[PDB]
Design an enzyme around this catalytic site. Structure first.
Site, PDB file in Angstrom:
ATOM      1  N   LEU A  70       0.835  -1.191   0.000  1.00 30.68           N
ATOM      2  CA  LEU A  70       0.000   0.000   0.000  1.00 30.68           C
ATOM      3  C   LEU A  70       0.873   1.246   0.000  1.00 30.68           C
ATOM      4  O   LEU A  70       1.899   1.298   0.684  1.00 30.68           O
ATOM      5  CB  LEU A  70      -0.926   0.011   1.217  1.00 30.68           C
ATOM      6  CG  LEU A  70      -1.930  -1.140   1.306  1.00 30.68           C
ATOM      7  CD1 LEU A  70      -2.673  -1.100   2.628  1.00 30.68           C
ATOM      8  CD2 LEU A  70      -2.908  -1.088   0.145  1.00 30.68           C
ATOM      9  N   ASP A  71       0.470   2.243  -0.782  1.00 35.56           N
ATOM     10  CA  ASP A  71       1.186   3.508  -0.783  1.00 35.56           C
ATOM     11  C   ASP A  71       0.874   4.284   0.493  1.00 35.56           C
ATOM     12  O   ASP A  71      -0.116   4.028   1.183  1.00 35.56           O
ATOM     13  CB  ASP A  71       0.819   4.339  -2.013  1.00 35.56           C
ATOM     14  CG  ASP A  71      -0.641   4.740  -2.032  1.00 35.56           C
ATOM     15  OD1 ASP A  71      -1.468   3.978  -1.496  1.00 35.56           O
ATOM     16  OD2 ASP A  71      -0.960   5.817  -2.577  1.00 35.56           O
ATOM     17  N   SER A  72       1.743   5.249   0.804  1.00 33.01           N
ATOM     18  CA  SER A  72       1.599   5.988   2.053  1.00 33.01           C
ATOM     19  C   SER A  72       0.253   6.693   2.142  1.00 33.01           C
ATOM     20  O   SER A  72      -0.291   6.849   3.241  1.00 33.01           O
ATOM     21  CB  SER A  72       2.738   6.994   2.203  1.00 33.01           C
ATOM     22  OG  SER A  72       2.835   7.823   1.063  1.00 33.01           O
TER      23      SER A  72
END
Ligand SMILES: CCCCCCCCCCCCCCCCCC(=O)OC[C@H](COP(=O)([O-])OCC[N+](C)(C)C)OC(=O)CCCCCCCCCCCCCCCCC
Ligand SMILES: CCCCCCCCCCCCCCCCCC(=O)OC[C@H](COP(=O)(O)OCCN)OC(=O)CCCCCCCCCCCCCCCCC
Ligand SMILES: CCCCCCCCCCCCCCCCCC(=O)OC[C@H](COP(=O)(O)OCCN)OC(=O)CCCCCCCCCCCCCCCCC
Ligand SMILES: CCCCCCCCCCCCCCCCCC(=O)OC[C@H](COP(=O)(O)OCCN)OC(=O)CCCCCCCCCCCCCCCCC
Ligand SMILES: CCCCCCCCCCCCCCCCCC(=O)OC[C@H](COP(=O)(O)OCCN)OC(=O)CCCCCCCCCCCCCCCCC
Ligand SMILES: C[C@H](CCC(=O)O)[C@H]1CC[C@H]2[C@@H]3[C@H](O)C[C@@H]4C[C@H](O)CC[C@]4(C)[C@H]3C[C@H](O)[C@]12C
Ligand SMILES: *C(=O)CCCCCCCCCCCCC
Lengths: 71, 128, 88, 81, 220, 122, 166, 171, 124, 127
Positions: free
Chosen positions: C42-44
């Site tokens: 997952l991206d930030s």
């Protein structure tokens, strides 16, 4: 808080209800409409009008004592 | 295109809209390094005594002492009678006293004149 | 004030239960110690939404200085337990 | 006492206002990744909540039922005296 | 007094059209009501101002207790933006809340009507400042707008509160306390108006458009 | 109201002035005009303790209503008939005030036409 | 008259007894919140008796019982004006406060200082009744400032909050 | 000092919270919440430290013009109507040392079980002091972060007030 | 940054930004949580005026100038309208009300000895 | 961004200490150790008398406590007040002033038997 029936909270769901809670809440709500209707039928003038508002532009000149133009 | 934020003394410039929060040089980054260095040293001395279990009392705070000392005792030795201090002293020291003297002296002279003439209503004025 | 207390088991279940409603995390690949970045990829920005999804669950804000340091469901549970005096 | 959290597979975005949100995001190549997490607010006992006009009319059904008889009871009683 | 009250009822009611906190909204309602009372003193109707005090106490007090019930259920949450769906989850609080919001807006024959609608009618038929009268009439409209805001954002729609909330109002103390004001909020106005001896010459005849203005503006 | 537009957005000399009415002699146009009668004497109103704004021609109906209320206690729904009688009696008193107002409006316009007629010829 | 005046003053004196008993005369902290509420309940009932008399015969009276101070030609006395305005607002205020206190027992059940909270609420009620029943300005001023100070103490109830003290 | 990633993430969190306040309704917020995410995903890869910075500054100026005048606040968050509410019930631990002996006698187990922590605290103090003064550079500490315990039986330095701090609903 | 040496008695006390304590970070771990201060931090010359119970200088959603213009305009407009509505009152089409016994001369405290000026009203 | 290797250890070390501290705050079953206390004979009676539900006999305690309250908080104060008003306040001039009762045409005065003449005939109209 303290007192009353202990109702377990329900996670992600519509909360529990009792019979007296639902019935009494309905009883007073119905009391409002009964009270509004009963009074609205006996005191209908209180919300619409009590006595007619006569129109000044219809009275005759003799009842008001307005002499004719000439004299 | 938006109305650039205008900052008064009671409406500080938001940090986000502040250009100083984006243009980060080596000095700016290093400047915060020393600020947190001193801030870290003070935070160390406090915790050595704050957490000490053999200490009962008040941790004397020299910063607090210096704050109160400047506000009370170090003012006069640093005062110089000049144009700014002299004019402000008279305007805020003597101005209000002269103003209120003429407001009250004028009012009482007016009222005293009416009472002598008999033109002031004092029908039931028996408490003074 | 009449609110039921929060327990470690109760906290953890709600923490995982929130993610299982997240369409971008596989329920079978989700664990108490599943890293949000190095495992679920997952991206930030999604990580921020995870913290937001927890704030609405427990109804209390989390500092952004501390919201960044929570990367797995285990750390989210520990923070909430520490932030609400939960010991059993 | 442990609380039994329901099974999470029953929360769905189908048939609720969240679906129409999916349709409008679909037309732009976007999708809602939290729609199922906010789905419980539209299903169960919260589904099909009353309207503003209906809410103000709560209890009117019984009130008018009791009103007509009340005046009707007076109508007969006033006829005698 | 007339002008001072007129701006207060208009201004405070205006500030209540966009507030989110439930307690704040009722507060700006109270200021709006007090402004209406000052207007009544400014039209030389001192006894109507007093009669509004007695009637206003019942439902304004009830509206705060009912809102207090909502706040406790949501664990000390007061912003209406995190409420909703309480029409059937808390049926008793909804009944009192709806009943109270109808006395505040001035539904005929409820407690509020015997003081509120009797004042606006007496305001129109008096030698008075025109702008002050207009601001009062606009304010009476705002009473319905923000009263509906609470009902819509606290009873209707879909719930916006967190996943776990202990929505329980089955406590005899809370139910009984609200119950009495609910009874009074309905009948108090009628009982008082028919028992207080007359002290002035009331105004009963007026144009058709000045006798229903209080009700007509409220509906709009 | 509506008559304000005829005084503010219009001529002011053609409209009554409530701070100056009546502006014409009371008997002008009324041969042997009748006078309103007060049924209740001064002593009756004084002993009845009526508010000064109620010490009017419409009194002697309020007294009867107040007497009934003291007697119907605790039956506070009673005495309704006397209320309507006093409400009606006051209503007649209110209409007569309007008649005085419409009479004032007509007389002012009558003076307008009379003055213009003799003014234009001059 | 005797019944009217006696039942008018007992309403005020009844509300003072819970405050007096806080000087460890009769001790019952568990039910003290209930004790205050029950006093308000009886205060409403007694106040109604003068109220019904006023409805019947329009009876009103002044009660200048205690001569406090005399500044030359100004005699100040503790005077209670039981008239239209007082006879009608006292039942309403007590009736509402009756509901508020019963509500408070539930809302403030978990408050450690609930006993203090109910003493403060009753202190406001006494001051308001002094304000409402005042017959001269000085007595009216006692209630005037009394309600203000009790408002300050109750607004800032949670005194660890910098935004409540403000 | 905050990195570009930190500032960008904060702006994303605030915008949704203000946007959430604007929309109120969840489904409407869900519709607009994703569109806001889309506007952020189209600049993730930007490797230009200058063009990227201009976006953030322009992004913030857009947030200010559209920020909710009255954003939603969690009750116990700074600004919400419960912040510092229970601070009036948080008593420091050292107050118990002033209790009358007849008052400590009401809780013999608590105070018997309390001497242990005081016994534990005194014993650990010397080690905690020694650990800090040997890991501290010559010029003094450069940050406020604290080291943990590097042995067994040793508690982390400066633990007493962190561990013993008052609860969140003490009364 | 010492204060200007204009002779007002500041000496060498540091001049710090005129920022209220309400602005400081509410989540940082302060030595004095309520004052937002750290032991040893130099206190502002006006710290007691900038405490959280007093003057607040935090950024506002609306520019300060636009706030004053809107509030002054609202108050200025309302006052004018009340004056406009004062000279143009709204009343009802009715003449002065009539009271008997010479407009209640005796009831309104009239002198019993000096007989009043007769006042007569006629049926209409 | 996450915790550095040492931070996770410190929080765990403290989180174990913190959770142990919160367990020590629990009270043993015997605590609080209340010193011996004696109640009145009346109090002992109701402790065991009211154990059974017996709605018919439960109202007795309700009336008992309300009967005592009315005697000590209503009857005694009104006795003190009435005695105070009748023999100390009303014996001084103008201490209690009553608005004189309203006399209507047709009433009978209880002090002299006088009958105020009624009002003249009205121009009766049914409206
Ligand atoms: C001639 C009339 C009397 C003149 C004297 C009174 C005028 C005001 C001069 C004194 C004001 C300053 C008092 C000392 C400081 C205490 C108050 C304070 O610090 O302000 C904090 C408070 C701030 O409270 P706040 O409600 O605005 O917000 C606090 C911050 N939050 C909400 C985030 C927690 O301000 C005041 O209450 C005082 C301002 C009101 C007085 C000015 C209006 C006067 C009436 C004009 C019409
Ligand atoms: C029934 C009717 C009743 C009506 C009652 C209500 C009446 C309300 C009347 C309307 C009030 C509107 C307010 C208008 C005053 C605005 C004052 C102002 O804006 O100036 C304040 C001034 C801002 O400028 P400044 O801070 O110096 O600029 C930044 C420099 N670093 O900052 C300063 O403080 C500098 C000193 C100037 C102080 C202002 C003058 C006093
Ligand atoms: C009466 C008020 C008189 C004000 C006008 C005189 C002040 C003035 O104009 O400045 C003259 C002089 C400063 O001149 P300058 O050369 O620039 O500086 C001195 C450097 N050696 O000033 C000086 O150097 C000496 C200061 C002389 C003036 C001091 C007395 C003026 C009044 C002071 C305030 C009094 C307050 C009293 C308080 C009353 C109660 C509140
Ligand atoms: C300087 C002190 C002397 C002074 O200036 O005051 C003189 C003033 C009277 O002077 P004058 O008004 O010219 O004569 C007619 C008075 N009926 O005195 C008066 O009687 C009128 C009041 C004068 C107010 C100004 C006083 C000067 C300010 C106080 C001194 C500050 C140092
Ligand atoms: C200006 C307005 C504001 C003033 C407020 C000032 C603050 C006062 C605080 C409230 C005080 C409550 C006052 C009510 C209690 C009255 C006290 C009292 O009884 O005093 C004696 C009084 C006679 O006083 P009096 O003749 O009027 O002249 C006094 C001149 N100094 O009465 C007597 O003659 C005594 C008769 C006693 C009969 C009852 C005894 C049985 C009851 C005993 C147990 C109780
Ligand atoms: C009457 C009321 C409610 C009892 C009930 O119906 O349950 C009870 C609850 C607490 C009681 C009071 C408090 O216990 C304090 C006092 C203790 C004694 O009972 C004497 C009077 C005393 C002042 C009590 C009067 C009354 O019996 C009270 C007020
Ligand atoms: C006049 O004396 C009162 C001022 C007018 C207020 C009422 C305005 C509403 C009447 C005009 C609309 C007529 C159509 C319903």
């Amino acid at each position: 808080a303290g007192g009353g029936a202990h109702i377990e909270p329900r996670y992600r769901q519509f909360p529990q209800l009792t019979r007296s809670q639902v019935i009494q809440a309905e009883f007073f709500s119905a009391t409002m409409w009964f009270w509004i209707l009963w009074r609205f039928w006996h005191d209908s003038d209180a919300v619409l009008g009590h006595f007619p508002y006569p129109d000044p532009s219809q009275w005759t000149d003799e009842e008001l004592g307005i002499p004719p133009d000439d004299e | 295109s938006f109305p650039k934020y205008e900052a008064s003394r009671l409406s500080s410039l938001p940090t986000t809209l502040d250009p100083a929060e984006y243009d980060i040089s080596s000095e700016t980054r290093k400047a915060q390094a020393e600020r947190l260095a001193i801030r870290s040293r003070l935070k160390r001395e406090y915790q050595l005594q704050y957490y000490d279990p053999s200490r009962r009392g008040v941790i004397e705070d020299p910063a607090l002492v210096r704050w109160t000392y400047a506000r009370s005792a170090n003012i006069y030795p640093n005062f110089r009678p000049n144009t700014k201090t002299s004019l402000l002293g008279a305007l805020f020291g003597i101005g209000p006293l002269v103003f209120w003297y003429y407001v009250f002296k004028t009012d009482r002279d007016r009222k005293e004149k009416l009472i002598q003439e008999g033109k002031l209503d004092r029908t039931f004025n028996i408490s003074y | 004030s009449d609110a039921p207390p929060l327990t470690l088991e109760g906290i953890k279940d709600r923490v995982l239960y929130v993610l299982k409603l997240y369409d971008k995390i596989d329920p079978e690949k989700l664990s108490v110690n599943s890293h949000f970045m190095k495992d679920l990829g997952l991206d930030s920005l999604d990580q921020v939404e995870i913290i937001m999804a927890m704030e609405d669950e427990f109804g209390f804000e989390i500092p952004d200085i501390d919201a960044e340091k929570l990367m797995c469901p285990q750390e989210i549970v520990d923070y909430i337990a520490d932030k609400k005096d939960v010991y059993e | 006492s442990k609380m039994e959290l329901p099974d999470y597979k029953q929360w769905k975005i189908e048939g609720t206002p969240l679906e129409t949100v999916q349709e409008k995001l679909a037309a732009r190549g976007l999708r809602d990744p939290w729609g199922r997490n906010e789905a419980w607010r539209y299903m169960g006992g919260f589904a099909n909540n009353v309207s503003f006009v209906g809410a103000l009319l709560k209890g009117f059904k019984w009130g008018f039922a009791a009103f007509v008889v009340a005046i009707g009871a007076e109508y007969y009683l006033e006829s005698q005296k | 007094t007339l002008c001072l009250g007129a701006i207060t009822t208009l201004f405070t009611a205006m500030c209540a059209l966009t507030q989110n906190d439930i307690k704040k909204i009722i507060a700006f309602s109270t200021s709006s009501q007090l402004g209406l009372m000052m207007v009544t003193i400014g039209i030389n109707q001192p006894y109507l101002a007093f009669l509004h005090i007695c009637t206003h106490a019942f439902f304004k007090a009830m509206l705060f207790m009912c809102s207090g019930s909502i706040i406790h259920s949501l664990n000390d949450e007061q912003d209406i933006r995190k409420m909703g769906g309480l029409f059937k989850a808390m049926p008793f609080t909804t009944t009192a809340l709806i009943v109270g919001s109808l006395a505040l807006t001035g539904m005929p024959f409820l407690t509020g009507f015997y003081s509120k609608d009797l004042i606006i009618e007496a305001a129109n038929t008096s030698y008075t400042n025109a702008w002050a009268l207009l601001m009062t009439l606009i304010a009476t409209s705002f009473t319905a707008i923000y009263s509906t805001r609470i009902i819509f954002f606290a009873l209707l729609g879909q719930p916006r509160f967190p996943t776990l909330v202990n929505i329980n109002e089955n406590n005899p103390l809370l139910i009984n306390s609200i119950k009495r004001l609910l009874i009074g909020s309905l009948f108090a106005g009628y009982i008082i108006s028919n028992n207080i001896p007359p002290t002035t010459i009331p105004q009963m005849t007026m144009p058709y458009y000045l006798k229903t203005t209080a009700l007509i503006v409220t509906i709009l | 109201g509506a008559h304000l537009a005829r005084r503010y957005l219009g001529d002011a000399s053609v409209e009554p002035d409530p701070l100056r009415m009546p502006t014409f002699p009371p008997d002008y146009g009324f041969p042997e005009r009748k006078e309103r009668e007060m049924v209740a004497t001064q002593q009756e109103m004084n002993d009845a303790q009526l508010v000064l704004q109620q010490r009017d021609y419409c009194a002697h109906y309020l007294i009867r209503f107040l007497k009934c209320k003291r007697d119907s206690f605790p039956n506070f729904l009673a005495c309704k008939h006397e209320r309507h009688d006093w409400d009606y009696c006051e209503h007649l008193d209110y209409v007569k005030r309007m008649k005085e107002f419409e009479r004032e409006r007509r007389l002012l316009q009558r003076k307008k036409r009379r003055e213009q007629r003799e003014a234009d010829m001059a | 008259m005797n019944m009217f005046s006696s039942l008018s003053l007992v309403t005020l004196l009844l509300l003072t007894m819970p405050i007096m008993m806080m000087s460890f005369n009769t001790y019952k902290p568990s039910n003290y919140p209930l004790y205050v509420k029950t006093a308000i309940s009886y205060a409403f009932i007694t106040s109604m008796i003068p109220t019904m008399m006023f409805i019947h015969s329009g009876q009103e009276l002044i009660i200048s019982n205690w001569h406090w101070l005399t500044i030359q030609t100004l005699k100040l006395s503790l005077s209670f004006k039981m008239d239209y305005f007082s006879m009608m607002f006292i039942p309403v205020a007590l009736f509402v406060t009756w509901s508020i206190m019963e509500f408070s027992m539930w809302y403030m059940y978990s408050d450690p200082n609930i006993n203090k909270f109910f003493k403060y609420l009753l202190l406001f009620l006494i001051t308001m009744l002094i304000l409402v029943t005042a017959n001269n300005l000085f007595q009216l001023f006692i209630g005037w400032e009394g309600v203000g100070i009790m408002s300050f103490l109750l607004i800032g109830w949670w005194y660890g909050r910098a935004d409540a003290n403000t | 000092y905050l990195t570009h990633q930190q500032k960008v993430l904060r702006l994303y969190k605030r915008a949704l919270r203000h946007l959430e306040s604007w929309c109120i309704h969840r489904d409407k917020y869900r519709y607009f919440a994703c569109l806001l995410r889309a506007r952020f995903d189209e600049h993730k890869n930007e490797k230009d430290m200058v063009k990227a910075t201009q976006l953030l500054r322009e992004a913030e100026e857009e947030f200010w013009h559209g920020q909710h005048p009255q954003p939603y606040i969690f009750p116990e968050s700074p600004g919400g109507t419960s912040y510092e509410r229970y601070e009036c019930y948080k008593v420091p631990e050292w107050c118990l040392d002033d209790w009358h002996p007849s008052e400590k006698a009401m809780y013999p187990d608590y105070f018997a079980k309390r001497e242990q922590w005081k016994k534990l605290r005194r014993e650990s103090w010397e080690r905690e002091v020694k650990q800090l003064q040997e890991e501290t550079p010559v010029g003094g500490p450069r940050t406020e972060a604290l080291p943990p315990a590097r042995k067994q039986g040793d508690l982390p330095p400066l633990w007493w007030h962190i561990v013993t701090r008052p609860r969140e609903r003490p009364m | 940054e010492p204060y200007p040496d204009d002779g007002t008695g500041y000496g060498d006390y540091p001049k710090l930004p005129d920022r209220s304590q309400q602005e400081r970070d509410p989540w940082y771990d302060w030595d004095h949580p309520d004052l937002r201060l750290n032991w040893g931090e130099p206190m502002h010359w006006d710290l007691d005026m900038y405490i959280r119970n007093r003057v607040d200088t935090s950024p506002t959603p609306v520019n300060w100038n636009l706030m004053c213009k809107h509030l002054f305009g609202f108050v200025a407009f309302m006052l004018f309208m009340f004056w406009v509505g004062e000279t143009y009152p709204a009343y009802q089409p009715v003449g002065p009300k009539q009271y008997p016994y010479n407009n209640l001369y005796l009831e309104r405290g009239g002198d019993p000895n000096k007989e009043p000026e007769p006042v007569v009203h006629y049926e209409i | 961004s996450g915790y550095t290797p040492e931070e996770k250890l410190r929080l765990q070390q403290l989180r174990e200490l913190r959770r142990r501290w919160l367990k020590d705050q629990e009270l043993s079953p015997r605590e609080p150790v209340l010193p011996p206390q004696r109640v009145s004979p009346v109090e002992r009676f109701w402790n065991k008398f009211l154990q059974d539900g017996a709605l018919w006999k439960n109202v007795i305690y309700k009336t008992y406590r309300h009967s005592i309250f009315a005697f000590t908080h209503v009857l005694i104060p009104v006795w003190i007040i009435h005695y105070y008003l009748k023999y100390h306040v009303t014996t001084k001039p103008y201490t209690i002033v009553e608005k004189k009762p309203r006399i209507f045409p047709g009433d009978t005065i209880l002090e002299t038997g006088e009958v105020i003449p009624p009002m003249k005939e009205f121009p009766d109209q049914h409206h």
